[PDB]
Symmetry: D2
Subunit: 329 residues, 4 copies
């Protein structure tokens, strides 16, 4: 009766919209046992019950449980996906929504979760989702102490997914066959690489020359990509996007758990790439069973480097501020 093949276990630290949605993907695909942890009592248990019922409906078998302590939620977790935190600053108008405004509200939460991971599952792969993304990934890395290849932040796959959908619609092709990437920080300074867009590897410039799309059209698509998060915040009225953020985070977790080696841009540790040190920023990377196995350095032209450098300069400033204000404990 000795267990030989144990199911993978993914812990959702934060069981709000994105956390619950990721639990749903795990149950739908029989990807792994799921634990839902939140500081709000009762709600995780209700969602865990609902998700457990999904397994019967779609004929899968994984365990979905709510846990109220960090130890019970984190022990044995192959992967930890962190969404705990605020989405909007209370009282501010949707018109002024800014992810950076979340910094003083979420930095302590993320640091605390990191300290618990260090204790309960130091060998886990951490995927941070909480905003402001790139700053939070660095806080998590420092607090959790895991090797730099075992921590990353989900964002660029989401921004790139938006970018891809818009291009797919313009070209009337499946997004599967649009490769479009956003690098940089997850915010107003993100960089949609219009120059790099390909359709099954064929350069977008050919479609322009051939009259399928225009330069302005692509420029508007890049701008739409940049403001997509806020666009959804304004339409929804309460909360922010969750369906695609969840699918992106789970796609990254699956590349790790199944050692797929997919090339997914995400917030990763920099050790010389693009000339950066001791910081995390959105870049193309390969995700496999050894975590972040490669960080891809793209050749940036004049204007791209300029936009990317802006995003770097900003996040370094925020990272300094966060460090200056970190609680001694």
């Amino acid at each position: 009766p000795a267990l030989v093949q144990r199911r993978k276990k993914v812990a959702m630290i934060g069981s709000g919209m994105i956390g619950g949605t990721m639990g749903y993907l795990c149950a739908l695909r029989e990807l792994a046992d799921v634990v839902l942890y939140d500081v709000v009592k009762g709600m995780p248990e209700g969602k865990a019950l609902d998700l457990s019922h999904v397994t019967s409906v779609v004929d899968t078998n994984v365990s979905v449980r709510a846990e109220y302590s960090y130890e019970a939620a984190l022990t044995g977790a192959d992967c930890v996906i962190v969404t705990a935190g605020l989405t909007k600053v209370p009282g501010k108008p949707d018109s002024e929504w800014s992810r950076n405004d979340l910094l003083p509200f979420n930095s302590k939460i993320i640091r605390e979760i990191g300290q618990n991971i260090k204790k309960y599952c130091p060998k886990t792969f951490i995927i941070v989702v909480t905003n402001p993304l790139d700053c939070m990934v660095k806080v998590m890395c420092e607090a959790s102490g895991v090797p730099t290849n075992m921590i990353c932040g989900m964002a660029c796959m989401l921004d790139s997914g938006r970018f891809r959908r818009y291009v797919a619609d313009a070209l009337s092709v499946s997004p599967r066959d649009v490769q479009a990437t956003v690098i940089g920080t997850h915010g107003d300074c993100m960089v949609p690489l219009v120059r790099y867009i390909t359709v099954n590897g064929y350069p977008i410039q050919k479609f322009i020359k051939d009259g399928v799309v225009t330069e302005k059209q692509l420029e508007e698509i890049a701008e739409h990509t940049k403001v997509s998060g806020g666009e959804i915040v304004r339409f929804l009225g309460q909360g922010s996007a969750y369906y695609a953020p969840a699918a992106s985070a789970v796609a990254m977790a699956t590349s790790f758990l199944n050692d797929e080696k997919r090339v997914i841009p995400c917030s990763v540790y920099c050790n010389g790439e693009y000339g950066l040190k001791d910081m995390f920023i959105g870049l193309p990377a390969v995700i496999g069973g050894a975590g972040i196995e490669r960080v891809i350095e793209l050749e940036l032209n004049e204007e791209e480097k300029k936009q990317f450098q802006k995003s770097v300069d900003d996040v370094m400033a925020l990272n300094k501020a966060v460090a200056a204000l970190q609680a001694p404990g």
Copy 2:
């Protein structure tokens, strides 16, 4: 280039928790193009954008769009799934939650949607979700005018899914291999058929004799099944269940769209079964390309007949109630 193969189209009338979740399943599986319709302005556009983004992330290609008029939402819909309505009575305590109290509020919404379906997509397959379920399916049938095999209500597959998950846990087996059914009205009077539970077709009785599960334990599972909706309502604090309800409605929609002929209990039109006529109640059925293709009239023991009659009394009282309101 003339379009020869058109994607199926599913309209979610109601884009709250369950409507958005069903749209997610369609995008995740490339099942069909999706239209999100709701009375609340803005929110459906937000969810449609989010869902359209999902198609790139998971490499599928379906169109997800918000539409604010019945005409744009309903035209061309192969299947219409209706979740529009309230989940709880405003100002009422969680301990006092009752699907039956939703009648006064959701009755006119359902009737209006059916009138529009009659006008814009009379050939569609209708799946109702809005509570009080069995009552709302009848309202929808009367307002929409569709053939009786082309409308049903999602409820029993969810109730059965709960029943199956609890039994699966007790037996330590995959719920894929637990066949357990709930029939009757989706409410306090639903009827979990303990006697009919099977494990890959093997009678639960032998597992009781073998000591894997006890009779008292099965009775507790049936009771838990009955109050599982209210249990989630209380735990959540706001709203009600949505993940399993959406997966159940989509499973039904898929059996229709792909003519799978799955055996799925749902609220179906009674043509004399159990002596019932002109009403909808949860029964085991087969869903295929022609809609409800079979309705199973299981033999009930004394206790089941008694519970089923209470289920029947519940739905007839609700239908009487709407009648006083129509």
Copy 3:
């Protein structure tokens, strides 16, 4: 960095029709890295290349490789699926095809593979497919020395699958919703349990009473089920069934690898069930991460017991003959 999440590995010992087809299912679903091994050289390498190409076409990433030695094929295998052996006896009419005639040819092959599993992956989960199935599972158990819960033979899921397809067709329902089971040995004495058939747990007797199907039709379906293997052998002309046998063996492996705990009838070790000891025979069982986690004992009626006893007495006779004829070493 160091690999933290390794892909599962399944070794197909025998790369003929069924072995290559199971390799195909693994590649298609990204289930596990695949190793193809065969005594015939050249062929496994051709199929491994073909299968490696499939991964690109269907966007998955697993390694499919041919291995020439037992050591290279078996080392590190989470599950080993054995199809090595003959399907038909040379120069013999299809009208006379019999799985028992293979006994003298396949006993030695199965014994040798088992001795190599013992050497190279004694902790693996073994799924035997090679005919005559129930006899070969016992030879494999003895030779490999693995715990009795870590070995089973694939047959009843296929026989039950045939049974279910015929019933599904008679009732016009999806076979997902037909629970029909065949127990006993994989051959002319198998026992399709007509009395136990259910449609989503509803007794088949209800459908007979309703006028949808008759007892006579059901008995004809049981007979068809029994002769389905020979029916395909005669239609194909060369070889035997492989699409469904492969799908059945991989479903069983998946239930093990993902600890699904599916209830799948298969040839399993009996230590008291149905009154049998020290032998393998087709029975309903639960397959999970600990291997065969439960052997289900059905309450059989007088006639069912008689049909099952015939199958038991028969396989006990073949097993004794095999033991009698075995080389001391």
Copy 4:
């Protein structure tokens, strides 16, 4: 009663290794009802039975049947995939295997099938597989008379798949994220476009500079790609590749049936691309619910043009050869 949603139907004309394998994919994914047709009697019924058994095993519900006549096999087919024909010349040594030699044997089989499609399912989407591919698609177009956007040949997705797998291995990434394309004639003169290789849209050139792979290695990969079909023929001893060929044809059929609009290189009708007219050759195309929806005409450098002209010369000689025969 009346069926509203009918399952898709795909007819495999030719039920050997590739035809049976595509049927397997249909049953495995519940993609469509399947018909297996072949000149060989018995075998198709054997595989149809085997495949029908698969549906139960994997919990799907599609109908798999063998059909004796063209009329029964073709009537109602949404898509027809043709693999009928020989794989190698009887008595010819494996070291002398050439798709071009199959011409005299397969051209008549393909013309006959084409005439039958015109008769029984003129509105179907035709995917030809039979070698020598580009030539056989032309034979099929002429005989079947279908709209130019409703016929294509599967080959370059397979050749590109090979190309992508080798590059994926060299780079240590999933082939999902390698975009590599082979255009031209499916034979020794096919053109793997090394310059157009991308890793999730990132130019392969930077990977060369980063030392992940060398130019010499990419060139050896391009050569391996060209001779992969023969490599497999040699290793197998009998017959040729069938798992990836089947997956490639079904992926094409799926993009058509669900109107996915995937960009898949395949043999398509030329209306002037590269000055090519009245012939089929492998080019990047968009396959959707209206069949071939766009043909992409990439800018080629000097070397690519040289290699593509040899590809063009190859199929033009074959088409001239067929013309002389029938």
